[PDB]
């Protein structure tokens, strides 16, 4: 279970498996690809 892109987060294991919950305004955000 997580959020996508700008998905209210307080922390980065809040996201998917590719979004990063940014500290800049609290928001998951993935950045690229693997």
């Known amino acids: ?3 996508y892109l700008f ?3 307080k922390t980065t ?3 998917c498996k590719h979004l ?3 500290s800049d305004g609290k928001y998951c955000a993935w950045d ?3």
């Open 7 to 9: 998905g209210g987060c």
């Open 13 to 15: 294991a809040d996201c």
């Open 20 to 22: 990063a919950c940014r």
């Open 1 to 3: 279970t997580c959020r």
């Open 32 to 34: 690229g690809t693997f």
